[PDB]
Each structure stands twice: as structure tokens, then as C-alpha cells.
Amino acid sequence: TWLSDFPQAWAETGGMGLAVRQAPLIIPLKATSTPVSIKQYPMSQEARLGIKPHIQRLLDQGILVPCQSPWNTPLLPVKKPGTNDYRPVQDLREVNKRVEDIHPTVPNPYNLLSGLPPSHQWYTVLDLKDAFFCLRLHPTSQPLFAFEWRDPEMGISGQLTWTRLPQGFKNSPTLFDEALHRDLADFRIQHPDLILLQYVDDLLLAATSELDCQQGTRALLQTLGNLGYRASAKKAQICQKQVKYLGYLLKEGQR
């Protein structure tokens, strides 16, 4: 009854997230950066119709809001199967080139895994849902990510932008990874015996016994939930001695 005891921790029963302890992000620009406004390539009705629902939902969630900005990057329509179902993908390369670089602190999967003793054989793997969106963007940095949105006939002014850390931004993974490390610091202190691996939105909890794991998984879910993050119940691999994590198959302490 996991999806029952921690309703607030699951993306399916807790609604979209928001990292309440994290201050709104300010994105510093390179010293010589000036706004770049790139035209929106015309978009076929089919693509637009495929994308519209996502846009509306994001507007309803306040993740997207209207705006007028000297910045503008293309919105691209991408399909998955072979022709159906679309999803909005923004080309932020021209923006990324104008943002000041930061040191990449996200460890590579290989080194991240080396810190997993053969002693902890019980695993609980969690995937955070819409991780980036949980981090708010400061009003001053929001304009930076604007894009044009046209609705068939009756459509909002023109530009929309994000109020949360967006997909496609070169520093999102790193900024999220550091934010979550700050939010789970105390938790690591209350569970000295537990092993916690973080790779952006992919989490691995390791325990010595199936029980410690159970108690660990509960405390983690409860902590993530109260902090404003959401884990995916559908993918959640709880208290297993074998799990899939970052492309590896963990079992008996191998890989």
C-alpha cells in the first residue's frame, strides 16, 4: 500500500511538484550577452494541434505564462512512434551559448556506482517526475526562455515563457542535481546506515536488510513529498534485490 501511505510523494496522487525550500533561480549571462530573437518557423496545423493540449495544461499549471520578451527561440514539434502524438521541444542552443558556464558537478554513472558497497543488497529505485519543473525560475530570468505561440484563430498575444527550470537549458541537470543534494542533506544525516545515490532525477537507495530498506524507502518518500518533489509510482522499484538503474542491472552486488 505504498501509493497509499505517501499520497503526497507520488506524481499520480500528489499533483505537480514545487521545491518549496529552493529559492527562485537567477541565470547569470556572459558579460557580452545581448538578447537574441529567433523567428518561429511556420508550424503545420497537425503539429500545432498535437502540441496545443500540452501547452494548455502547462498554462493551467502556471508553468507557462504570457510575456513580451526581447528573447525568443524556436518551438519544434517532435513525434515519438512514427507519425502520431507530438510534444513541444524548444531549441535553446542560442540561449545556452549566451549563458555563463558553471562547473559540471553531476558525476558520471560509472563513478557514481563505485560508491555502492557489496554489503547493501536491498535496493529501492525512484524516478522523479518533471524534476526540472519543480525548481522555480526567478522573474528576472524568465524572459530569457520565451518562445512564440500561435493558436489557430483565437490565440494568446504571442510569446509565452517558463516560470520553472526548462528542458533544453544546458545547466538544468546540474542545477537540479545540486538543489536536490541540498534538500536531501539532512536526510542523509538521519540515515547514516543508508546509501543514497543521486543522478539528477534518478535515485538509488541501498540498505543492508529488507527492513532497513523498507524504513528507508518510507522516510525518503516522506521527505521527498514534504520537500515538493514527486516520484513516479509506475516505475518505482521498491525493496528489490535486483533493479534497473542508469542502464545497469544491479544484482547480488554486480555492476
**Does 41 count as an annotated binding residue?**
yes
Give the C-alpha separation, 94 to 111, whole Å.
32
**Does 127 count as an annotated binding residue?**
yes
Give the C-alpha separation, 213 to 125, whole Å.
11
Selected from 92, 146, 165, 206, the binder of DNA by CB under 7 A is 92
Selected from 20, 41, 56, 102, the binder of DNA by CB under 7 A is 41
Give the C-alpha separation, 72 to 36, whole Å.
7
168 binds DNA (CB under 7 A): yes
Q: Mapping DSSP to helix (H, G, I), strand (E, B) and coil, where does residue 58 land?
A: helix
Selected from 19, 76, 195, 227, the binder of DNA by CB under 7 A is 76
Residues 6+ apart with CB under 8 A from 121: 206, 208, 241, 252, 253
Interacting positions 7-36 with DNA (CB under 7 A): none
Q: Mapping DSSP to helix (H, G, I), strand (E, B) and coil, where does residue 202 land?
A: strand
**Does 85 count as an annotated binding residue?**
no
Residues 6+ apart with CB under 8 A from 116: 195, 197, 204, 206, 250, 253
**Does 91 count as an annotated binding residue?**
yes
Measured at the alpha carbon of residue 81, what is the angle toward residues 77 and 86, in degrees to the nearest 5? 25
Which range of residues in 19-27, 90-98, 113-121, 138-146 is near DNA by CB under 7 A?
90-98
**Does residue 201 contact residue 178 with C-beta atoms inside 8 Å?**
no
Which range of residues in 60-68, 70-78, 110-118, 194-202 is near DNA by CB under 7 A?
70-78
Selected from 91, 130, 148, 202, the binder of DNA by CB under 7 A is 91
Which range of residues in 87-95, 133-141, 150-158, 195-203 is near DNA by CB under 7 A?
87-95
Give the total of residues touching DNA (CB under 7 A).
11
| Smallest gap from residue 24 Cβ to DNA (A) | 21
Selected from 24, 35, 74, 109, the binder of DNA by CB under 7 A is 74
End-to-end CA distance of the chain: 30
Residues making contact with DNA (CB under 7 A): 41, 74, 76, 78, 89-93, 96, 168
Summarize the annotated binding site as residue ranges: 41, 91, 93, 107, 127, 171, 173, 201-202
